[PDB]
Model the fold of this input.
Amino acid sequence: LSTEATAKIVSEFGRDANDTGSTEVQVALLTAQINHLQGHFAEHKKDHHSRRGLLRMVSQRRKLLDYLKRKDVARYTQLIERLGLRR
Amino acid sequence: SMQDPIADMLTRIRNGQAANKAAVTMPSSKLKVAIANVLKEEGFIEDFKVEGDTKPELELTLKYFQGKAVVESIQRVSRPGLRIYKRKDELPKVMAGLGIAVVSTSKGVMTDRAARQAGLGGEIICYVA
RNA sequence: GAGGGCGCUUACCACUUUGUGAUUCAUGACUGGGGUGAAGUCGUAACAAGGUAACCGUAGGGGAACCUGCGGUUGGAUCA
RNA sequence: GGCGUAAAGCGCACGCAGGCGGUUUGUUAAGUCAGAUGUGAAAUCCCCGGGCUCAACCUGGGAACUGCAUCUGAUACUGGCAAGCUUGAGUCUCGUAGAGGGGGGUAGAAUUCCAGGUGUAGCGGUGAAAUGCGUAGAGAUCUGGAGGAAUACCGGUGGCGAAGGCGGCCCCCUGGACGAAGACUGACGCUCAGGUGCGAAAGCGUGGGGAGCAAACAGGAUUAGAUACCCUGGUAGUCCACGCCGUAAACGAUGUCGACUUGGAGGUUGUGCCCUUGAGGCGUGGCUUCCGGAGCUAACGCGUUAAGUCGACCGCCUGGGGA
RNA sequence: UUAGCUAGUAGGUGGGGUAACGGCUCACCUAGGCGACGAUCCCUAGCUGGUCUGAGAGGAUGACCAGCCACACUGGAACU
RNA sequence: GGGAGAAGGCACGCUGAUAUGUAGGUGAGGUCCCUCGCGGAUGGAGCUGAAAUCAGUCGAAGAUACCAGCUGGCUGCAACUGUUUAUUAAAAACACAGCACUGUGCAAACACGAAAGUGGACGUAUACGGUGUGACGCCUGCCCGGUGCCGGAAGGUUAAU
Ligand SMILES: [Mg+2]
Ligand SMILES: [Mg+2]
Ligand SMILES: [Mg+2]
Ligand SMILES: [Mg+2]
Ligand SMILES: [Mg+2]
Ligand SMILES: [Mg+2]
Ligand SMILES: [Mg+2]
Ligand SMILES: [Mg+2]
Ligand SMILES: [Mg+2]
Ligand SMILES: [Mg+2]
Ligand SMILES: [Mg+2]
Ligand SMILES: [Mg+2]
Ligand SMILES: [Mg+2]
Ligand SMILES: [Mg+2]
Ligand SMILES: [Mg+2]
Ligand SMILES: [Mg+2]
Ligand SMILES: [Mg+2]
Ligand SMILES: [Mg+2]
Ligand SMILES: [Mg+2]
Ligand SMILES: [Mg+2]
Ligand SMILES: [Mg+2]
Ligand SMILES: [Mg+2]
Ligand SMILES: [Mg+2]
Ligand SMILES: [Mg+2]
Ligand SMILES: [Mg+2]
Ligand SMILES: [Mg+2]
Ligand SMILES: [Mg+2]
Ligand SMILES: [Mg+2]
Ligand SMILES: [Mg+2]
Ligand SMILES: [Mg+2]
Ligand SMILES: [Mg+2]
Ligand SMILES: [Mg+2]
Ligand SMILES: [Mg+2]
Ligand SMILES: [Mg+2]
Ligand SMILES: [Mg+2]
Ligand SMILES: [Mg+2]
Ligand SMILES: [Mg+2]
Ligand SMILES: [Mg+2]
Ligand SMILES: [Mg+2]
Ligand SMILES: [Mg+2]
Ligand SMILES: [Mg+2]
Ligand SMILES: [Mg+2]
Ligand SMILES: [Mg+2]
Ligand SMILES: [Mg+2]
Ligand SMILES: [Mg+2]
Ligand SMILES: [Mg+2]
Ligand SMILES: [Mg+2]
Ligand SMILES: [Mg+2]
Ligand SMILES: [Mg+2]
Ligand SMILES: [Mg+2]
Ligand SMILES: [Mg+2]
Ligand SMILES: [Mg+2]
Ligand SMILES: [Mg+2]
Done:
């Protein structure tokens, strides 16, 4: 992804606006790339070698978001509402 | 991954002895300090030494006699897949008295001979034969 | 007079009856294959480079071993 | 007990439940251990003993009755719970390498077909021939087309991908890996029954295309016969888009992850330093092929990418056929 | 090579009943409960202290003896 | 999707209670607003009104009359709904969606007409005519000697001129 977009992402979700490694930040970067890449997998439908990378991104987002749900329930609920994931 | 730090320690001792090392090294921990303390007490290593401020490296200096290794065999008993907790009459006696068996009892970690002389069982971590 | 008994009746329920499945055993002309048999008939596919290297999958064919197509494997032989 | 070759590692990955879980402190004390209490009917089994003259048998006392529950403790391990760490796992910054995937263009060589010119009697074929193509002028040959497919040399046990696989060049979209100094989150980890996704070729459906090649089929031979090899043709199919099938000697006949253990030879792709003092030299990573040590192994052989020493989780085998 | 099962079924409130709690039995309501830690279904079986074997962990089994359960020609029902 | 209304069985009248007519439907008043009228909210009188459960009772028989499936099993033929021999044949015949072959490049092929023209079509190869077959599943094997049809114009024979 582009450097201005990731700088936007860490500025809108960051702890100290430098850290780039927090769980909210990693889920925000993952969801930005997933909702950008759905447009690729709507026009190219036989693109399985990148569809696997999308499935990796999905599973990794789900692992981080489950760790957030175990860690802070209030932070997880406000984060899933701020992003716009369903569950 | 590192699903058994104690078997990492024991496998490092067995490998270093069977491959003729002198000073083997591993990352430290409290149970590793206790087991290496038992081994230095009974005489299966020369001396151990834990060096490092935040995360340390535990170093074991292996013994030898006429070139051959000192620990003949060493194995796990209570692996994490299947733990072995033993009462006091059902304690082992490895190598008919010669070898030692390390037991964690309520009074810290101690050789099974001391566990029999203190009258309580525990968990058998290893069979240093 | 109360109350009782018998009797009638309703409720429940067994034997019995019909209808229709499910499972299991027996049996059934004929048939798909399998196994064993006395010097039976037709071949000779495999083991050596087994005389077309075999084999795996799949499809077609053919008296039968099998043959050929497409892809794969070395568990294939010769290296002056 | 076992899984390279004897029967046995799912084709490969994702992943819910489940199983296991780095390290420091504090608490709890569930698992664990220890004492006591209740209890484990008696008979039997066992240890000492008594009797039937001996034994079998009868019988006294005892432990055992490997358990269950309750009370009381202990706190090393495991668990819960609460706070921390940073090595595990991951994110950012900047590049490098790549036939990784998907879509669209395009280039030349060659084969075939057509059209036209030359020019004449052979072409094609195998072991040797023939069917076939030829006096309607072929094969050879020069020009102009048209068409479809595959990409010579690079090209190398080279690279990339999880596996299948991927090979001219260009663009668009895109995944992954790896390296460097930093920074950051702070156990977020590993494996995974069922479940899902990808999965060569052949095959099927719908619709296109159709040059080569080519199962089926026809003809020619060889043959004892030859439903085969060999020859001349030749339709499916190969190809493009959508789907379906889910199989292979899907092979490294070696599940994944992680740790430790003598070396050498190369290749590949970074990167640090040193005077790159010329096409050097001193190290650290990742990936990869060959030889080989102890170890192991039934032997062959594998051998820091293990079939060595181990740990976690999963799959599978129990004589050959029948199958 | 049995993945769905269950309508008094899971629970509630009220009534009745029982030596006694309880859907034990009814009225009404809620729509539940059981299930891959194997429900439901099929086949076999009395269970246990023990006995035989085994070095032991186990495997097989339940004769006599002793405890418990069930049945008394088959299927029911109640009385004392 | 179907089979299927498979088969097979139970309840069915009147009266009383729940409820002196229930749930539901309709909404008069009345009250408040009211962008003021054929306006809108609680408001439910009156009117209508199933259907169910419990109890009673009658008859031999409660859908009591009229109207109102015979059901099941195996199989042939045809996929089906359709159409025909008006007036002895309604089918297993005809059609049919689908399949294939073939013709046709548009002033189409083809037909009706000496001809103009028109249908084809105010359509343009995913269209139209003709032919055979008759959904869907598995399939369609061998022969070009005969008769056709298509390609050849080198040669033999060949008309008017
Ligand atoms: Mg990532
Ligand atoms: Mg042979
Ligand atoms: Mg031969
Ligand atoms: Mg052969
Ligand atoms: Mg052969
Ligand atoms: Mg061979
Ligand atoms: Mg053939
Ligand atoms: Mg074995
Ligand atoms: Mg074999
Ligand atoms: Mg094998
Ligand atoms: Mg494998
Ligand atoms: Mg995995
Ligand atoms: Mg732990
Ligand atoms: Mg406790
Ligand atoms: Mg007893
Ligand atoms: Mg005696
Ligand atoms: Mg604890
Ligand atoms: Mg740091
Ligand atoms: Mg931190
Ligand atoms: Mg699975
Ligand atoms: Mg294919
Ligand atoms: Mg096809
Ligand atoms: Mg076919
Ligand atoms: Mg086709
Ligand atoms: Mg062709
Ligand atoms: Mg297989
Ligand atoms: Mg392969
Ligand atoms: Mg291979
Ligand atoms: Mg295999
Ligand atoms: Mg071994
Ligand atoms: Mg080697
Ligand atoms: Mg191993
Ligand atoms: Mg082996
Ligand atoms: Mg009650
Ligand atoms: Mg009561
Ligand atoms: Mg034994
Ligand atoms: Mg009785
Ligand atoms: Mg009786
Ligand atoms: Mg007949
Ligand atoms: Mg009909
Ligand atoms: Mg009809
Ligand atoms: Mg008509
Ligand atoms: Mg008629
Ligand atoms: Mg008519
Ligand atoms: Mg008629
Ligand atoms: Mg016209
Ligand atoms: Mg017909
Ligand atoms: Mg017909
Ligand atoms: Mg035919
Ligand atoms: Mg003909
Ligand atoms: Mg002819
Ligand atoms: Mg023909
Ligand atoms: Mg002609």
Observations:
- The CA atoms of residues 19 and 53 of chain A lie 25 Å apart.
